Amino acid sequence: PPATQISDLSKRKPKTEDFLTFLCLRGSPAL
Amino acid sequence: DKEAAFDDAVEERVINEEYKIWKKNTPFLYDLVMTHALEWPSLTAQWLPDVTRPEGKDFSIHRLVLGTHTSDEQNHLVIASVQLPNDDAQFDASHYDEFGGFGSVSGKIEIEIKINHEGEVNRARYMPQNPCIIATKTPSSDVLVFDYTKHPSKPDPSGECNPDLRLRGHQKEGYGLSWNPNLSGHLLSASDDHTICLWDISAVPKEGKVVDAKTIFTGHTAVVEDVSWHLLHESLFGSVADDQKLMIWDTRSNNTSKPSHSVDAHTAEVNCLSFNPYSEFILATGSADKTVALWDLRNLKLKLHSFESHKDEIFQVQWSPHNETILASSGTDRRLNVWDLSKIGEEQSPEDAEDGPPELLFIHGGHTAKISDFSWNPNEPWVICSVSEDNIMQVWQMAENIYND
Amino acid sequence: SLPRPHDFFDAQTLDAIRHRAICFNLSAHIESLGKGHSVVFHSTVIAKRKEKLLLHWMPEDILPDVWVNESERHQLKTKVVHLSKLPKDTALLLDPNIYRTMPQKRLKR
Amino acid sequence: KCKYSFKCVNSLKEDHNQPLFGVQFNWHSKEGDPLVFATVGSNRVTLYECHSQGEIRLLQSYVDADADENFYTCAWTYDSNTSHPLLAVAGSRGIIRIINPITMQCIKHYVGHGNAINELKFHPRDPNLLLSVSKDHALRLWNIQTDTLVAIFGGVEGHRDEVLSADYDLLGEKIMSCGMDHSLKLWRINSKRMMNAIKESYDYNPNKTNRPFISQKIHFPDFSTRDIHRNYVDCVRWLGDLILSKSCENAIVCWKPGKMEDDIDKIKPSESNVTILGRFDYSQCDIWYMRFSMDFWQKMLALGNQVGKLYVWDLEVEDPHKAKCTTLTHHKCGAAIRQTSFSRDSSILIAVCDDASIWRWDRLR
Amino acid sequence: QADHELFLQAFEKPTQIYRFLRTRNLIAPIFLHRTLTYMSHRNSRTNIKRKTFKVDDMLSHLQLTTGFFHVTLEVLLVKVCHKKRKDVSCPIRQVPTGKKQVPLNPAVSSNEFEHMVKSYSLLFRVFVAQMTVFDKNRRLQLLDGEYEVAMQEMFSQGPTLQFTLRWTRIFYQFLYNNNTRQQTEARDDLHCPWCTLNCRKLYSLLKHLKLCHSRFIFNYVYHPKGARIDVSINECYDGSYAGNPQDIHRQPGFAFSRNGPVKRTPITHILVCRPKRTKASMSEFLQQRTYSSGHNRLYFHSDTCLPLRPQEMEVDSEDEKDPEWLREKTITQIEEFSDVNEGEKEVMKLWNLHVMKHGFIADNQMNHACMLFVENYGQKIIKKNLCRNFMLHLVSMHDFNLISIMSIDKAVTKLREMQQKLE
């Protein structure tokens, strides 16, 4: 349950140094 | 530049994807989905008033004037015949193939008369009083008037067919044309040479190959793109040009330089103009400012609800005659937006505000290139014929479910 | 059955789309702090008023710059604006890949 | 025994790590300009530019991974009116792309082949004619200037099977073509009809004419033979007036059409006897689809080996080649070499491997 | 990881493509979602058609001011306009002012302002300083108030000039051909994670997801607590080029370049016959049979894979009575004989070629065939001096009929004119 879908999924389009840290910078693509 | 070319390629790809998305919303937004790809690319559209619903054949004989806008291969002038599902639509009827409600096989889009043309076909405006005659605009200085009855069908492998009626009043290439529903004849054309020319037509001389311009309206500084008459009153019409003025000119005013209505109505280029017969005051006009604004004849200085929905120059506007408060527009942004007045200047839910202006009711996004022309069907309630520059003619009816209860 | 004819889209435009998305996310944080439906921004004190403050916003032609009272600035320094509420005149300048006129170079009129 | 000595200078590797088939040098570069060579492999083509002092540098790289594409041929050419080098790549889908490194963008795409293109050569006198041997049991000649199919060699009695590779004569008058049908059938371009077709294509305009270009289907070859090669032939050359065709028999047979005393240009189409004159023999060279490129001065002939070795040959001394010549071995040669290329000046030689790992050598000179 | 990571990347790539596709729809929608009849939950505004069109009217100076703290200066104006068709970029007009000998580290506003210009802005130069006088939305800004107007390098700690400025439970499961699922929640009421859309209930959500998003398909399954959806892209997706098929195979630098009009074949399409205008049904959540006519594709030549243009269709038969290779084979077979004469070989080759080129099959017509040579090929026989062979062959008929003595005499007399004409 990674809370809001956006913060855990829509980080795939910005897959570089533009994720603004948050859960996107953490292991969001992986488990 | 190379970056500009790459951006244009990406834009074309996105346009194709958006069109593919739009195709899926055919049944939930339209009554009929009829799109025909003319062999010779279409540059204009119209709806002939002929109708015929015989017993045992529930379809109605509908004729539409197509166009021909390829460079030079025996230039023609295509006139076809289409049908309508009628009240007994019979979508399946356990026998749809022709269908159980109209012709769905064989001559769906069969061509009746193909008179050869000399050049390009810009407009295909006909005379509703006498639907036999059809006028055409060509890059040359002369207009072409044909007749699908007298001229034989099945064109031979040749060209430069004599139309027996050529209206030579222009100088440069033209892009405007409009007939007078009130009085038979009286065709006016707005061309690129900073002026709009009108021909008497009507009782044209027999075999009148050489026809001079009855009147010329040179009052706009910049290039004009449309000229439309007034349905209610035949004594005035509007001239719209790139100069920021959607001017309206009254006929027989003894003034060919100063339009009767000189309100700018915009701060950018304007390329469309039309009115409504049921709503005489309502008069939508298109512009480059992407701010197509409705105006009232009684009060033109005041600005009514400018429909803030366009995104480019608008070249073709037209309000629905049958309804009362329905207007529409189209232009280079390849969108046919249909306006509305009942929701104008009224409170709305936040979702309605997010969807756009309440006054804007319908928008049609079934085009890939610049919209050439669009017109409502006089017989059918919502059927509209819209054409683009990709050689696609679209016949569709806006759903009336929104105007229920 | 017959497979798909060909992928007309995303052949080469995918890299440009990714570049534009990266640029937008870095510059505006629309998908980071804008809740996914509004344009976020970070404002700085460009000027002030004898008493307020002028909390100008960094993204030009994306987030308009307005004035805020001293307490108002100190509290709501950061302002987020809805995309449909964004100005239409500067929408084209915000990003050039949202709408481009391909055939307007020639013909047209 | 030979009077040549090449030494390894530098080497590199590619990003995609896939087998590399076609590699050719830029013979059209004159003196002063540093040597530049290209390589192919997978869906990403790569260039290179190696300086002196044993240094190799990467200039440019491309990729075509939009679809399941592949590349086999790396024929080099140039534009007469533009004066920039062009590289020809084709395969898989069979689309022939003319890459322009100067502007870093493709110039033209050619479609019409029924399968993947296997080999590509360019016509010497007119650099705009490309010899494309397609796998659809046919061979075609392409005019780059007008983007038209000059002639479709194959028909009633032409190319019963796929044509693996084909070559050109020293002067560009006679065309050889090997194939998978165990045949060395030949199509002369010396007939008056060939000149008429070439001239018409030179002054052709597809826009002007509604009818399609009238390609000359040469159904009947001017000379064909089967007895030379027992199996399929995948390489062929033109050693002066002789033929240096090569097949999977780990040998490049040097033969001459017809009898001994008859002139080659006066050989009747009904000749049905051939004589063998020379044959260069090596070992461990039995793989398929591998090509050899000799030096411009014809003193050097090199053919890559699958084990990793290299061979050079002398083809100018009195009598045909004999003795054993010399072999070139690299310290890090483990893959299979599929093509070798010399420079216009016999000083630089680069060998490609089955991992797009170019190994440049340098002669003492 | 490893193989799992590679599979995750291969899943994200189409997911990335869908993300880029959905992002652009967020910025500029194509059509209003209000008019979606099936999605009636959202924008459920009341309808009143009694509002007639006759009743539209009812229905609807500053005293500023030092020096930089840590030198003549000028104040310029920066203007942004609307991107017209003629000019790609917004035109900018500069209206600078004079300079004064202000002290180095120790003003009255003009009526320049007061709708072609989108906004008015002023920028200082003291060595530059850009200020946002007016907002992008024409909001109030640069009002009364004095402070340190900082100047951009190349109040604040940087150099500034003192000026007394005055007035004027929803779940998702991402899939890829049923490869692997995912667990993601929702933020707003029936909000699509791809694009911003505030649907009122599931009716305005499932229909919009199925229809307005053609890139990927959905299998609505409903949830005891909220709405459960599954997201995956269908395999087929016939979303290829919808324009002229001729531009699909055009050379690079010209395909779909929109240089000018392109000719094509006629075609008509019908896919939505008549909507049923039915009511909401759960079973709908849990065939097309389109109608087409004419030619709606690009054709190819028979000889090779060259695309056949629509203009190349007037005859385009590509089927000949006697092919060239057949003539060459017949000539070779005639010349390959060993027990025939030179003139005899020539005359038999001529007769066989004429028969192949004309394809005579009627027996009686064979008689007339013997005349045809005289009309066409008599000159060749006269020049080659093959009259005797011609006569021998013509006499060689009674073995198989094919005319009679009268025809032989007529033909021999007819060619006698050619021999005497040459002589």
Q: DSSP secondary structure string, B167-196?
A: EE--SS-B---B--SSSS--EEEEBSSS-E
C touches A, CB cut-off 8 Å, minimum 3 pairs: yes
Question: CB C66 to CB E140 under 8 A?
Answer: yes
3-state SS of chain D is CCCCCEEEEEECCCCCCCCCCCEEECCCCCCCCCCCEEECCCCCCEEEEEECCCEEECCCECCCCCCCCCCCCCEEEECCCCCCEEEEECCCCCCEEEEECCCCEEEEEECCCCCCEEEEEECCCCCCEEEEEECCCEEEEEECCCCEEEEEECECCECCCCCCCEEECCCCCEEEECCCCCCCCEEECCCHHHHHHHHHHHCCCCCCCCCCCCCEEECCCCECCCCCCCCCEEECCCCCCCECCEECCCEEEEEECCCCCCCHHHCCCCCCCCEEEEEEECCCCCCCCCCEEECCCCCCEEEECCCCCEEEECCCCCCCCCCCCEEECCCCCCCCCCCEEECCCCCEEEECCCCCCCEEEEECC
Cβ–Cβ of C67/E141 closer than 8 Å? yes
Specify the DSSP class assigned to residue E256: T
What CATH code would you report for D4-365? Answer: 2.130.10.10
Phi-psi region of E396 (alpha: psi -120 to 50; beta: other; left: phi over 0): beta
CATH at B139:
2.130.10.10
Burial B337-376 (b: 16+ CB within 10 A, else e): bbbbbbbbeeebbebbebbbbbbbbbbbbbbbbbbbbbbb
Domain assignment of residue B177, yes or no: yes
Q: Which residue of E lies nearest to A14 if distances are taken between CA atoms?
A: E16
In a domain, B353, yes or no: yes
- The answer as to whether B1 is a domain residue is no
Any idea what the Cα angle at residue B192 is, between residues B186 and B196, rounded to 5°? 25
On whether residue B3 sits in a domain, the answer given is no
B2 within a domain of the structure (yes/no): no
Nearest-neighbour CA in chain E from C83: distance (Å):
7
| Calpha distance B171→E26 (Å, rounded) | 46
Tell me how long chain D is. 365
Residues sharing a CB contact under 8 Å with residue D56, sequence separation 6 or more, in sequence order: D9, D10, D11, D12, D48, D50, D358, D360
For chain D, give every domain's residue range: 4-365
Whole-number Å distance between alpha carbons of D174 and D256: 13
The set of chains that have 3 or more CB pairs under 8 A with B is: C, E
Which positions ≥6 away from B254 have C-beta within 8 Å? none
* DSSP string of B324-363, one letter each residue: SSEEEEEETT--EEEEESTTTT----HHHHHH--SS--EE
Return the closest-CA partner of residue B62 out of B401, B393, B399: B393
- At C68, is the secondary structure helix, strand, or coil? strand
Q: Which of A9, A17, A20 to mutate to test the interface with C (most CBs of C within 10 A)?
A: A20
E335 at the D interface (CB within 8 A)? no
- E409-415: list long-range contacts, CB under 8 Å, 24+ apart: E410/E371, E411/E370, E411/E371, E411/E373, E411/E374, E414/E371, E414/E374, E414/E378, E415/E373, E415/E374, E415/E378, E415/E381, E415/E382, E415/E387, E415/E390
E119 Cβ contact partners less than 8 Å away, ≥ 6 residues apart:
E79, E80, E133, E134, E135, E136, E138
- Smallest CA-to-CA distance from D147 within D87, D201, D211 is with D201
Q: CA-to-CA distance for E376 and E353, rounded, in angstroms?
A: 13
Whether B contacts A, i.e. 3 or more CB pairs less than 8 A apart, is no
In the three-class reduction of DSSP (H, G, I as helix; E, B as strand; rest coil), residue B321 is classed as coil
Is D288 in contact with D21 (CB distance < 8 Å)? no
What CA–CA distances, in Å, run from B273 to B28, B178, B286, B293? 30, 11, 6, 10
Helix or strand (DSSP H, E) at A7: helix A5-9
Distance CA C62, CA C86 (A): 7
- In chain E, residues with a C-beta closer than 8 Å to the C-beta of C46 are 131-132, 149-150
The DSSP symbol for B126 reads B
Interface of D with C in 48-77 (CB under 8 A): 66-67
Secondary structure of residue B144 in the 3-state scheme: strand
Closest CA in chain A for residue C37: A6
Chain E residues whose beta carbon lies within 8 Å of the beta carbon of residue A11? none
Per-residue DSSP letter, E55: G
Q: Which residue of E has its CA nearest to A12?
A: E16
Q: Which residue has the tokens 């699922």?
A: E181
On chain E, the residues whose CB falls within 8 A of the CB of C10 are 17, 20
* Residue A23 Cα, gap to closest chain C Cα (Å): 10
How close does chain E come to D107, measured CA to CA in Å? 7
Burial annotation D332-359 (CB, 10 A radius, 16+ → b, else e): ebebbbbbbbbbbbbebbbbbbbbbbbb
Which of D338, D285, D365, D358 minimizes the C-alpha distance to D8? D358
Distance from CA of C19 to the nearest CA of B (A): 12
How many separate helices (H) and strands (E) can be counted in chain E? 10, 10
Rounded to the nearest 5 degrees, what angle is found at the Cα of E40, between the Cα atoms of E35 and E41?
135
Could you give the strand order of the β-sheet that contains B336-340, starting from the edge strand earlier in sequence? B314-317, B326-331, B336-340, B362-364
Distance of alpha carbon B80 from alpha carbon B61, whole angstroms: 11
Contacts D–E by Cβ distance under 8 A: 40
Q: Which helix (H) or strand (E) holds B240?
A: strand B236-241
Q: How many residues does chain B have?
A: 405
Q: Cβ separation of D106 and E252 shorter than 8 Å? A: yes
CB contact under 8 A, E193 and A1: no
Find the angle CA(D83)-CA(D85)-CA(D90) to the nearest 5 degrees.
140
> Are A18 and C22 within 8 A, CB to CB?
yes
Domain-embedded: residue B215: yes
| Preceding-residue numbers of gaps in chain C (C–N over 2.5 Å) | 51
Q: How far is A1 from chain E (nearest CA, A)?
A: 6
Q: Which burial class, exposed, middle or buried, applies to E197 when counting CB atoms under 10 A from its CB (0-12, 13-18, 19+)?
A: buried
Residue D132, classified by CB atoms within 10 Å of its CB into exposed (0-12), middle (13-18) or buried (19+), is buried
Instruction: Give the count of alpha carbons within 13 A of B351, CB side only.
Output: 21
Identify whether the C-beta of residue B3 lies closer than 8 Å to the C-beta of residue B9.
no
**Contact predicate D244/D237, CB 8 Å:** yes
Strands B371-376, B383-388: pairing kind: antiparallel
- The contacts found for D296-299 with CB under 8 angstroms, 24 or more apart, are D296/D27, D296/D342, D296/D344, D296/D346, D297/D346, D298/D239, D298/D240, D299/D346
**Calpha distance D243→D254 (Å, rounded):** 5
Beta-bridge mates of residue D350: D341, D360
The two three-digit tokens of residue D104, written as one number: 């870093």
Q: Is B301 part of any domain?
A: yes
Of D109, D155, D156, the CB nearest to E251: D109
Angle between helices C13-28 and E3-27 (to 10 degrees): 70
Number of domains in chain B: 1
Cβ atoms of B171 and B189 closer than 8 Å: no
Within 10 A of D236 (CB to CB), how many other CB atoms are there? 27
Q: How far is CA D351 from the centre of its chain?
A: 15
Q: How far apart are CA B372 and CA E64, in angstroms?
A: 55
Q: Which residues contact D210 (CB under 8 A, 6 or more apart)?
A: E311, E312, E314
Residue C90 burial by CB count (10 A; 0-12/13-18/19+): exposed, middle or buried? buried
Q: In what order do the strands lie in the sheet with B166-168?
A: B133-137, B142-147, B166-168, B210-211
Answer whether C4 sits within 8 Å of E145, measured CB to CB. no
- List, as ranges, residues 331-360 from B with C-beta within 8 Å of E: 332, 335, 341-346, 348-352, 354-356, 358, 360
Single out the residue of E162, E172, E168 nearest to residue E192, CA to CA: E172
- The whole-angstrom separation of Cα B269 and Cα B314 is 9
Is C90 near chain B, with CB under 8 Å? no
Task: Give this entry's resolution in angstroms.
Answer: 3.4
Q: What is the spatial distance between Cα B358 and Cα B348, in angstroms, rounded to a whole number?
A: 7
Nearest to B389 among C100, C101, C103 (CB): C103
Detail the DSSP E strand segments found in E226-347: 231-232, 267-272, 291-294, 299-300, 307-308
Q: Which of D363, D255, D233, D355 is nearest to D302 (CA)?
A: D363
Instruction: Output the CA–CA distances (angstroms, integers) from residue C82 to B52, B351, B353, C85, E306, in the order listed.
Output: 53, 13, 12, 5, 53
Q: Taking chain C, what is the end-to-end CA distance rounded to the nearest angstrom?
A: 45
Instruction: Write the CB contacts of E262 (distance below 8 Å, at least 6 apart in sequence).
Output: B41, B70, B391, E244, E246, E247
Report yes or no on B232 lying in a domain: yes
Contact D152 E325 (CB under 8 A): no
How large is the C-alpha radius of gyration of chain B?
21
3-class secondary-structure state, position E384: helix
Strands (E), B48-179: 62-65, 78-82, 111-114, 133-137, 142-147, 166-168
Q: How many CB atoms lie within 10 A of CB B119?
A: 19
- Report yes or no: C4 at the D interface, CB cutoff 8 Å: no
Measuring CA to CA, which residue among D159, D194, D195 is closest to residue D179?
Answer: D159
Residues in E 86-105 with any Cβ partner in D closer than 8 A: none
Residues of D in contact with E260 (CB under 8 A): none
Q: CB under 8 Å to D156, separation ≥6 — which residues? A: D219, D220, E325, E328, E329
Q: How was this structure determined?
A: cryo-EM
Q: CB burial class (10 A; 0-12, 13-18, 19+) of residue E338?
A: exposed
Residue B294: which H helix or E strand, with range? strand B293-295
What one-character DSSP code corresponds to residue C36? T
b/e sequence B127-140, b meaning 16+ C-beta within 10 Å: bbbebebbbbbbeb
Tell me whether residues E31 and B25 touch, CB distance under 8 A.
yes
The residue in chain B having the minimum alpha-carbon distance to the alpha carbon of residue E276 is: B91
What residues make up the domain containing B165? 8-405
Q: What is the Cα–Cα distance from E214 to E30, expressed in whole angstroms?
A: 14
B154 exposure class (CB count in 10 Å sphere: 0-12, 13-18, 19+): exposed
Q: Contact, C55 vs C61, CB < 8 A? A: no
Half-sphere exposure (Cβ direction) of E170: Cα atoms closer than 13 Å: 17
Q: CA-based diameter of chain C, in Å?
A: 75
E9: Cβ–Cβ under 8 A, 6 or more apart, which residues? none
Report how far residue B318's alpha carbon sits from residue C73's, in angstroms, rounded to the nearest whole number.
49
Neighbouring chains to D with at least 3 Cβ pairs closer than 8 Å: C, E
Q: Round to whole Å and give the CA distance between B247 and E422.
A: 86
